[PDB]
């Protein structure tokens, strides 16, 4: 085709989970904010395992509600 700024500049290779948002303004890197504020410029483990995250308000206050032998919550089940 032709030459383009899309070809010029490369985006950050960040996973969906890590990405805070897909907005055009948030497209850039996090360290960009610090670099702008300072007016200057400047690796997964072998077995990267994460335990599933939960909403902050629900996880910090989990009701002690149970059923026959399974914990029941508005968002999650479990076994106990």
């Amino acid at each position: 085709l032709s030459v383009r700024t899309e070809d010029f500049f490369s985006k950050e290779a960040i996973s969906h989970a890590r990405r805070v948002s897909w907005a055009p303004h948030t497209t850039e890197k996090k360290q960009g904010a610090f670099a702008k504020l300072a007016r200057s410029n400047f690796s997964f483990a072998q077995e990267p395992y994460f335990e599933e995250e939960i909403e902050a308000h629900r996880k910090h206050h989990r009701p002690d509600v149970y059923i026959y032998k399974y914990n029941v919550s508005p968002t999650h089940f479990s076994l106990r």
Binding site: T5, D7, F8, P48
Partner: protein, 137 residues
């Protein structure tokens, strides 16, 4: 007859028989009345960020028997005029060509006035592949 030569000699017909059994699965499913051919699911999970924070794409292509039959039977569309009139460029121009020359800022010696939209030399050297999300050149 080497060990592996004998192994493959014995098993290649056996692998063909196993594949024949696998095909017979769908053949029964069709003779039952369900003429629709076996469908393979589409995999959305093909774009990844590897351990070194590098973009990776898995290319998955599915061959449609109906499309293959149509191609083998009917003529293809007439070739576009541009395709057969323009040549195949012998070079591959850079994704981010570097041009230090620019006539916008007075006294071009001043670096702090160069347009930012044009690439840097580091970008020109680094941009050997399409942008991250994109795969086709």
């Amino acid at each position: 007859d080497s060990f592996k030569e004998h192994y493959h000699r014995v098993h290649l017909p056996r692998r063909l028989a196993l594949q024949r059994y696998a095909r017979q699965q769908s053949l029964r499913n069709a003779a039952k009345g369900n003429v629709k051919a076996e469908e393979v699911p589409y995999k959305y999970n093909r774009w990844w960020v590897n351990e070194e924070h590098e973009f990776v794409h898995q290319y998955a292509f599915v061959e449609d028997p109906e499309v293959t039959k149509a191609k083998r039977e009917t003529l293809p569309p007439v070739t576009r005029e541009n395709i057969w009139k323009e040549p195949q460029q012998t070079f591959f121009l850079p994704f981010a060509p570097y041009v230090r020359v620019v006539d916008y800022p007075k006294d071009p010696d001043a670096k702090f006035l160069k347009p930012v939209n044009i690439p840097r030399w580091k970008d020109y050297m680094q941009r050997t592949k399409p942008v991250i999300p994109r795969t086709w050149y």
